[PDB]
């Protein structure tokens, strides 16, 4: 089958291009010695939205570590997350906020502007000499003409107008805008938090941690390798019956694919073990808030994630499904945090969760979010909730920023 050989050659060429791209990358960190407690650079200091969706030109100074936007639902509560995802650069279909980029523009106006101010004063800055202490990211969406950009600096000097600079800056800051879990919308949060079957938990965890795509690519490459090996045996038979140039090309491609597959298998095993270890440890540390003790177990025989929790009353770690609604909701929230943890994300955003938890459990879940997220300085979190956090007694803790919208 010549199509199998063609697929093998195409996969080999793709691997060649990927290894050239890997070879092209260099080191970007210089290790400025300097002085820990202080947050690194890259977090969003402020966002201003001029004629964007519903409300008019609006300023919002997000905090460094944990943010609690209390914009009420139905008043453009999700506008901030959509604006951040669009400005940082993301696919429209991934966002799923609006039918088209044209509709994001306010009605009656031809253009809308999204301006972000990433911080560069603190360490880890990306070319702090050129961009200064701030990097401004402004995107213009017009009904007529293509969407425009500029990556201007504080002085207004437009450093660039392209989009590849967006990706370079974002990747240096490590903001997974391409991953639809780091920026959880309402529907995605509902789908994740309501997961019931262990298979659903496994699917959501592997997809969000970007481990499912790796396994899909690996299995596709393995199938291509097996089919190409069978066609290689057939080609050997035909060659003996009789071509040598083709036989050398196919044998070289097959050997390269075999070695690449072994390397990729080792890489995937290491990555899966590391990610699952981080998730397990963070879940164990999260359950201690409720005076519980539990663990995660990932099974490939059942292709499922099993949560085991031991509470105060019993002496045997029952299955998490053998619990009550509040305990299961707390476990799901802890799993969400323990899935955010392995993928080190500079910025994380989330919509409301108050409808998935009822009364006391909801307060405990908000307490868990605050306690686990206000400590870390590497990750800035923007939580958009309609429920007033100020009613919760756990607001006295420093590092939590609540921006309650005066306009309902």
């Amino acid at each position: 089958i010549e199509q199998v050989d063609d697929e093998l050659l195409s996969l080999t060429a793709q691997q060649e291009n990927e290894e050239q791209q890997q070879q092209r990358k260099r080191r970007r960190h210089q290790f400025a010695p300097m002085t820990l407690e202080e947050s690194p650079s890259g977090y969003i200091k402020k966002v201003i939205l001029r004629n964007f969706m519903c409300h008019e030109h609006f300023e919002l100074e997000l905090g460094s570590r944990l943010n609690f936007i209390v914009g009420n639902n139905g008043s453009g509560k999700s506008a901030i997350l959509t604006a951040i995802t669009i400005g940082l650069g993301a696919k429209a279909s991934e966002t799923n906020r609006g039918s088209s980029l044209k509709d994001l523009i306010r009605e009656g106006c031809y253009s809308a502007k999204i301006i972000l101010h990433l911080d560069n004063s603190k360490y880890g800055a990306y070319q702090q000499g050129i961009f200064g202490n701030e990097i401004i990211v402004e995107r213009i969406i017009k009904r007529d003409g293509p969407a425009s950009f500029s990556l201007r600096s504080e002085n207004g000097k437009e450093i660039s107008n392209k989009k590849k600079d967006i990706q370079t800056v974002v990747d240096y800051f490590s903001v997974p805008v391409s991953n639809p879990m780091c920026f959880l919308s309402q529907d995605a949060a509902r789908s994740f938090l309501t997961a019931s079957t262990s298979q659903d938990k496994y699917s959501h965890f592997m997809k969000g941690t970007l481990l499912q795509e790796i396994t899909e690519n690996l299995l596709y490459a393995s199938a291509i390798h097996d089919s190409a090996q069978e066609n290689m045996a057939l080609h050997l038979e035909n060659l003996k019956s009789l071509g040598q140039k083709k036989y050398m090309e196919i044998d070289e491609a097959l050997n390269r694919l075999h070695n690449s597959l072994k390397a990729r298998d080792q890489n995937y095993k290491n990555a899966e073990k590391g990610t699952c270890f981080d998730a397990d440890m963070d879940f164990r540390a999260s359950l201690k808030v409720r005076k519980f003790s539990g663990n995660l177990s990932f099974i490939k025989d059942t292709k499922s994630l099993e949560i085991y929790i031991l509470t105060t009353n019993d002496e045997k770690a029952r299955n998490v499904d053998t619990l009550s609604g509040g305990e299961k909701s707390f476990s799901q929230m802890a799993l969400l945090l323990a899935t955010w943890k392995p993928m080190r994300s500079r910025i994380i955003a989330l919509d409301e969760f108050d409808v998935f938890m009822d009364q006391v459990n909801r307060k405990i879940g908000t307490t868990l979010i605050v306690k686990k997220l206000k400590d870390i300085a590497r990750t800035q979190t923007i939580i958009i909730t309609p429920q007033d956090i100020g009613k919760i007694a756990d607001i006295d803790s420093s590092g939590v920023s609540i921006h309650r919208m005066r306009d309902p």
């Binding site: 691997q15 990927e18 290894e19 791209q21 890997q22 990358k25 260099r26 080191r27 970007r28 960190h29 290790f31 010695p33 820990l36 880890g124 490590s174 790796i214 690519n217 060659l239 040598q244 036989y247 044998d251 050997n255 070695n259 690449s260 072994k262 390397a263 990729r264 080792q266 890489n267 995937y268 290491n270 990555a271 073990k273 590391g274 270890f277 981080d278 440890m281 080190r344």
Partner: protein
Amino acid sequence: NKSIVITSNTVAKSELQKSIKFSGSIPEIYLDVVTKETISDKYKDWHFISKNCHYEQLMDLEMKDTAYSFLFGSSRSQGKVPEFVHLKCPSITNLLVLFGVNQEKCNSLKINYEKKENSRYDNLCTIFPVNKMLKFLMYFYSDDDNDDVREFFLKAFICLILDRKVFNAMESDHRLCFKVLELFNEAHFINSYFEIVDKNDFFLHYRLLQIFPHLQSALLRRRFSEKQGRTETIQQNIIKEFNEFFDCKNYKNLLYILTMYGSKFIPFGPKCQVTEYFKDCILDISNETTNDVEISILKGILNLFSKIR
């Protein structure tokens, strides 16, 4: 007759089979798994002993050693039971020949990195048990002599313990090895060791720190010495070496990170800046699709060391 070889394994498997120093079966599956690694250097290592041990003479030494007149602990003086050891093996070089080291390596106790003697396939040569070998070597210590003989003994011991076969067949407690190490000054031991091995051969550095962990700090003080590092501190030199290995893409030597961690300069912990910089660079290069496995191994190891309090 155009197709004559099977990938590149045929020549490698054949010429591993020819120089095999073993009288047995040697199934082709072993040769295939050895010669088709291409990812890790598990089967290429420093082999001090490259010939079959003289089993008969070594057993004669052993029955002489187990039962003898004094039947007491061998003292460093009085010649270390000369009466039979000089009749059997008069010199330490003869003892090393009995162990399996050839004369050419005995004459020049160094690891020839040009001849790739630090990366050789296992010769599958039978070796005599390590503890009795260390005892026979201790019989040639002879504290009361000139410096050249002691230096030769020290370098021979260092070459022996770094051997892959000796290290694998080594006992859990390094009682005899600890005794030999305590015979010599620690700084003198480290200086002789760095005379033997290359200074950037961090794989053997990690092996030595596996044998003698308590040497770690001292070894670093010989690798990134403050006086020899000009006004730069030891941590700055460690950062510079990490930078140079990172830029040269010597990921195996970079991984053998395993030597640095745990010392006073680079400790375990979550709040250290150096580990964060290392991880920041590792996540920079890591692609997880087409990479060297050493990058993922470094990512996992650095994460583990960051978690260790």
